[PDB]
């Protein structure tokens, strides 16, 4: 973001900014956190089934928007509802954002 | 404090085009002596790193068991994959009279009086898994009272 | 120091390690300078006061 983006090798400087942006999305908003989370709000139980199995290895209460094809056993606070329509996801994301704003008093 | 306890090391192998490579597996167990106990398997290419990696997962694998005064609650079975451990509480049985790999897991759990004997293939890692599920389903009268009858007294007199 | 040997840079001469120092005189007596004589060995440049 400032400094060695030119200093030694221009092609290899394009390697690092090819390294950067793939790491930018995979490790997105996790770098601001540090340490383990306290809860975990999932929007699809079936698709992200690794994390629910991963979070239940530790002591993390999770929050899954579940569709009818998945299995609601590892999730603690199960939420039934559609999750493949875009307008459906903005309900749950808009609710979980505005409520946690009220919770950060 | 944690009172760690080793049971058995082993020399396992696997082969490649160059030859065969050994390693070591070492089943251990840890336990507080007052109702917490946990085992962990662990395996590595050298016995100091094998037993240390065994304990490090045994710390996270601890389970709570509810007992009375150094002995069990009731008789309880223990079946797991060719290892039928029997456990009888034996109120002041004057020592833990059990076989190998049960004498470890019962001691660090904190009991001192149980009579026990393993029926079947006396294999060490499969028999310490046999006592654990046999101990974690064994229930105190408190849990029995608060699901059934709803008096702590009359359920055992 | 680099700055002492940098006498040559701004000016010239050589280095400044040499102790620069003007022969100053001691104390104990006041006075009023009434007469100054200057004698010059022949060949030496007479300065402006001589």
């Amino acid at each position: 973001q400032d400094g060695t983006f030119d200093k030694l090798t221009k092609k290899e400087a394009l390697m690092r900014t090819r390294e950067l942006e793939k790491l930018e999305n995979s490790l997105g908003g996790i770098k601001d956190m540090g340490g383990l989370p306290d809860a975990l709000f999932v929007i699809d139980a079936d698709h992200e089934h690794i994390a629910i199995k991963e979070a239940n290895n530790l002591g993390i209460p999770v929050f899954a928007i579940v569709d009818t094809n998945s299995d609601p056993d590892g999730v603690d606070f199960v939420i039934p509802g559609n999750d493949d329509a875009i307008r459906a996801v903005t309900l749950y994301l808009g609710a979980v954002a505005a409520t946690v704003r009220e919770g950060r008093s | 404090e944690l009172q760690e306890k080793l049971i058995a090391v082993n020399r396992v192998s696997k082969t490649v085009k160059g030859g065969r490579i050994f390693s070591f597996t070492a089943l251990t167990v840890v336990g507080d002596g007052n109702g917490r106990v946990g085992f962990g398997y662990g395996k590595a290419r050298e016995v100091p790193a094998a037993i240390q990696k065994a304990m490090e997962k045994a710390r996270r694998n601890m389970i709570n068991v509810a007992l009375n005064n150094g002995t069990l609650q009731h008789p309880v079975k223990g079946v797991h994959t060719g290892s039928r451990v029997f456990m009888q509480p034996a109120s002041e049985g004057t020592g833990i009279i059990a076989g190998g790999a049960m004498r470890a897991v019962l001691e660090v759990a904190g009991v001192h009086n149980v009579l026990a004997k393993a029926y079947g293939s006396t294999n060490p890692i499969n028999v310490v898994r046999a006592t654990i599920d046999g101990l974690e389903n064994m229930n105190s009268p408190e849990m029995v009272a608060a699901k059934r009858g709803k008096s702590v007294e009359e359920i055992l007199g | 120091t680099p700055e002492e040997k940098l006498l040559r840079a701004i000016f010239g001469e050589k280095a400044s390690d040499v102790k620069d120092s003007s022969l100053r005189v001691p104390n104990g007596v006041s006075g009023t300078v009434i007469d100054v004589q200057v004698f010059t060995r022949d060949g030496v440049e007479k300065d402006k006061r001589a």
């Binding site: - | - | 680099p2 700055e3 002492e4 940098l6 006498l7 840079a9 701004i10």
Partner: protein
Amino acid sequence: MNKEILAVVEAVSNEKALPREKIFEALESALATATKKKYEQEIDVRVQIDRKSGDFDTFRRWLVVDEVTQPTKEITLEAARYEDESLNLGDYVEDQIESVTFDRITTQTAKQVIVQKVREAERAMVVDQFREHEGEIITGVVKKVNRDNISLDLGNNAEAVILREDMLPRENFRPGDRVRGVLYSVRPEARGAQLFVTRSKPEMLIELFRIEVPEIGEEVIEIKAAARDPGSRAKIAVKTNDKRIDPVGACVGMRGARVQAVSTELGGERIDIVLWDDNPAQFVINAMAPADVASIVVDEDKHTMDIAVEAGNLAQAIGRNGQNVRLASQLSGWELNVMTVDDLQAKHQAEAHAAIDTFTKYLDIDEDFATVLVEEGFSTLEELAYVPMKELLEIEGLDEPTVEALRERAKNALATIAQAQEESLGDNKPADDLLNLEGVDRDLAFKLAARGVCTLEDLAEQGIDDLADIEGLTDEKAGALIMAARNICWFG
């Protein structure tokens, strides 16, 4: 000569990682100051060093200003533009002046200014790079021990200070000893010690635990609070989000090895490690360790907690000189009152009796009904006056008319109490009525009201003789106030 300037600039730029430009600006200022000292008159001087040759030109600088206060160093914009039309306010007009010969005097001045520039560049960037150290446990060598402070050498011409309050009470350092401490403040005393180091504050304990406990450095365990009596005893509260990790066991380590390493560095300070709880009562129980707590009563309004202990545990709960309760109170943020179970019951009975007496006296209710109000949790007239009507209607035997009457009586009792005190002293009633007479300060109004002169009418009825004993009231001032009161009451 020429190439030597470039070689010096390159050597200093590479060794001190400093911009060549900043070194030249400072040499120019150094040479200007050395030039100013050769003239008997206060002149302004600019020096310019050529960046390729190392040659330098010296001026008689004339700070272009709007209004000239110093004719020897300042020139008007109109006069500056007569010489060069391109000049603006804040520029310099020059004058061909003989550059000072670079003797060992200028050389010494240049060396001093370079050293000072390096302190504000190389050393400043070193402190910026050591952002962790500025906050973590820096290590220094004791250079000097004074009565009131210890000077530490950190290397690279950085000096730190430990103040007497920042030391442990039993520490004795000698010149040459190595000392660790937290850098808790960076000020701007470049010449001397800008760095302030502590060994006594709680941050020293937190950072020692961060170094000794990897799980704290990895953010797996968090220290939520630390309370400390330096060189005697501390308490730390620890939390983890990982249910597989015991945070207390991790901080203690195998047979206490980790906590003993921290204790040894703190001169044998006793460290208690407690589990942080999000429930305040459970957290205070944990903070009171090693004393067993029998019951807790929480007063949220006073931000206080009454802690009952068994009579055998009372001395342990208080600790030596109250050290255990004080450290628990500092760790929780709550005021902690430690008493026996019998004393807590006696306190609650005395409070219940005082509430019953208050309600019987002010609400005109019987003792039986006052007892029911206290058993339902009402202790003050304010609670009865302001609590939601639904909570008062949940009490067995209260109807909506009786609750309304009880609230009206509680409000009237609160109003009467306030008015009575305001008339007795000078809070509001005498601070307006008796203080109406021009000249009455609040103190004099309360002195008048202490004699039963509570209103402006009461003051209008007085003689000078009735007020003559009031400290600060002269007969003339008494006469003026009585006449002012009479003018308002009898002639308004």
